[PDB]
Symmetry: C3
Subunit: 252 residues, 3 copies
C-alpha cells in the first residue's frame, strides 16, 4: 500500500497520509510523496484546490523520529517535511481528525485553510522532549494566532484544541468528528467555483505581502495584478455577469 494516497474528485486533489499504524508520522516516503503530490496539484490544469488529510481518523503525529535518527531523507532540500518549505501555488486545505501534533501541526499550518473535527487537537510538544519544532511551526504559529499564546504553546508544549484554535482564528471551519474531509471538500468547491488565475494571484499577494515594505508593496502587488487585467477569465467574468449567466473559466 502506498504511504500516501492521492485521489482526484473533479478539480480537487485529495492527498492522504496513509501510515495509520505509525500514527501517520512522516518518513522519507511520505515526505517525497507529499512533495510529488503538490507538484502534481500545481502542474495539472484540471485541478484547482488540494486537500491534505490523514488515514484512520488521525491527521499526523509528526515527523517519524526513528526514520530521521536512522538517516532517511525526511527533510528534503527546499521542501522540508513534504512541503513545509515550499507550499503549492494553488489553494491547499488541511482536513484534520484526531491528533495533528508536532510536525503534524506544522503540515496543517503550511496549508492555507484548516478544517478540523470538533474533537481534534494541535500542539508543538517538541520542547518537552528536548527538541525544537523545525518544520515551520515556530515561524507560522505566531502568524496565525495571538503572538503570546503561540509563545506559550511553544514553550510549554501544551495541546491546543480544535475549538480553541477555531476561536483564535487558526481553524477556519469546525466539522463533525469523521466529517472533516467532506467539509474541506465543500470549502474547496467554493474556491474552485472562482477564477483560478485570480485565486492563485490572490493567494500569492496575501502570502508574500508580509515581506513587502510600505513604500514598495503596491508596486510589488501590481506586478502580480498585471496579467489579471487582460486575462481571458477577467473578460469572461464581466461578460457572463453582464449576460446574467454563470462564468466559464479557462485559467487564461
Amino acid at each position: 500500500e502506498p504511504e500516501v494516497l492521492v485521489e482526484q474528485r473533479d478539480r480537487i486533489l485529495i492527498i492522504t497520509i496513509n501510515r495509520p499504524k505509525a500514527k501517520n508520522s512522516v518518513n522519507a516516503a511520505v515526505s517525497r510523496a507529499l512533495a510529488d503530490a503538490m507538484d502534481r496539484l500545481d502542474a495539472d490544469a484540471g485541478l484547482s484546490v488540494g486537500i491534505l488529510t490523514g488515514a484512520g481518523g488521525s491527521f499526523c503525529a509528526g515527523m517519524d523520529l526513528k526514520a530521521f535518527a536512522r538517516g532517511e531523507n525526511v527533510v528534503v532540500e527546499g521542501r522540508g517535511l513534504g512541503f513545509t518549505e515550499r507550499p503549492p501555488a494553488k489553494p491547499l486545505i488541511a482536513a484534520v481528525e484526531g491528533y495533528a501534533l508536532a510536525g503534524g501541526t506544522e503540515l496543517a499550518l503550511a496549508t492555507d485553510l484548516i478544517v478540523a473535527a470538533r474533537d481534534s487537537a494541535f500542539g508543538i510538544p517538541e520542547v518537552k522532549r528536548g527538541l525544537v519544532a523545525g518544520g515551520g511551526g515556530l515561524l507560522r504559529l505566531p502568524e496565525r494566532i495571538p503572538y503570546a499564546i503561540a509563545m506559550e504553546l511553544a514553550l510549554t508544549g501544551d495541546n491546543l484544541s480544535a475549538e480553541r484554535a477555531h476561536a483564535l482564528g487558526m481553524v477556519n471551519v469546525l466539522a463533525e468528528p469523521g466529517a472533516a474531509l467532506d467539509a474541506a471538500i465543500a470549502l474547496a468547491e467554493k474556491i474552485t467555483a472562482n477564477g483560478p488565475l485570480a485565486v492563485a494571484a490572490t493567494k500569492r499577494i496575501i502570502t508574500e505581502s508580509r515581506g513587502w515594505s510600505l513604500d514598495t508593496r503596491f508596486a510589488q502587488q501590481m506586478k502580480i495584478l498585471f496579467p489579471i487585467f487582460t486575462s481571458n477569465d477577467a473578460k469572461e467574468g464581466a461578460i457572463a455577469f453582464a449576460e446574467k449567466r454563470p462564468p466559464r473559466w479557462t485559467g487564461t
Copy 2:
C-alpha cells in the same frame, strides 16, 4: 459637490456624496478624497478625519481616471498622516472594503457588511484589501475571505478586531464622532507621532526599531504640549493644547 467636507473643532468629516450610484468612486470623488486628506494633514488645528458615505451606504466599490498615481483610489495607496476613522453603513463591498481598511479605525453599523468578492468574477482586489485584511483579522480568516469572496458581517469583523465599534444602524457617524472626540482631546503632536510610529514600525527591524522610533520621539520631549500636559495634570484641570 460629489464629496462634502466639514470642520468640527479638530475633526474633519469627509462624506462621499453620490448615493444614486451607492457612493461608488469616480474621478471627482477620488480627486476630492485626496484633496481632503491633504487638507486634514496640512491644518495643525485638525487632528482626526472621518470618512462616511451619504444616505445609508458607505461605498459600493469602483464605479475615467479614478486611480490617482501615488495615491490610488482617493487615498488607498497613501493614507493620511493623521488618524482616520471610517463610519460604515450598509454595504462596504469590494473597493468599499478597501477604503475602510485604508483608514485606521472602523466604526460600523451592526447591520453592515464587508467583503472582497473580486475572485468570483475572475478579478483580484488591487486597492490594498489583500495587503490590509491579513493585518487586521486572523491570517487564515483573511485568506478564506479572499479566496472564497464571501461577505464578512460587521459583527464578525468586530469579533475579529477589525471593527473597533459597533453602532446602531443609522448611527455609525455619531459613534465615529464620539471616538474622534476621545482622540482630539489628546495632544495633537503626540497623537500624530503615535500613529506614525505604529504605522512605520511594521517595517523596522528589531535591531533598529528603537532608534527609528527615537527620531520621531525627539521633538515631543521639548514640545510646548508636553509641558502643558504636565502643568495641566498637577493643576487637576483640562489641558489647553497648541500643537507645538
Copy 3:
C-alpha cells in the same frame, strides 16, 4: 527597602519592583537593578525562567516622571526602561496586579508571557498628557492584539482591562486578585520542566523570525536548531521517553 527585590525559588528568578509608595514606577535605580537581574537570569546555570512582578498590589505605574525631570539616567543605552530594548534570552513572565500603566504596560509587553489578576488594568495613556510611549509599547502592542485595537488604545489612551486583554490574547492567564505571582510560578514550572536548550532556542526563533524574509527564514532557523540535533538533552529526552520516566536535563 532595596528598590528591586530578587529572589530565587528553585530554578525561577523572581524579580519584584519594590517602590509601592511610588506605585512601583521606574527611576534610575529600578532601571539598573532590572537590567542586573535580567543579566543574572541569563548568566546563572541554575536559572531557567524569570518572573517580573511589583510589590504592594500594583505592577508598575510607568516611568518615574519626577526622576526623569530631575535628570536621572532612567532610559539606559542599549537597554531602555530596565530591559525594554534588550529582553533576556531565558523566558520571562510578567505577574501583574492592580495597574500596569504607561511604561508599566511596556515592561509587561517586553516579557514573553503575561499572567494578570482578574481586576488589573493595562494601557498607554501617554497621549492624554501630550507624551508618546517610548519604551516599546507602540512597537509591541500592535503585535499582541488586533492591530486596529492597538491603534485605538494608543490614540485614545484608554485603559485596557485584564479581562479584555485576555480575550484579545495579550494576557495568557487570568489570576485571582492577589495571586498573580502564584499563577506565574505554576506557568514557570511547566516551562522549567522542559528541555532548557530547546526552550531557549524556541523563544529565540519565535522572537527573531518576525524579522526574517520568506526565502531566508528556514535557513536562519536552521542556524539556531543546529546544536539541538546533537545536544545531550535531545538524547536524554528520547531515553527518558523510552524508559517512561522524567527526563533529567543538563542544558547540553
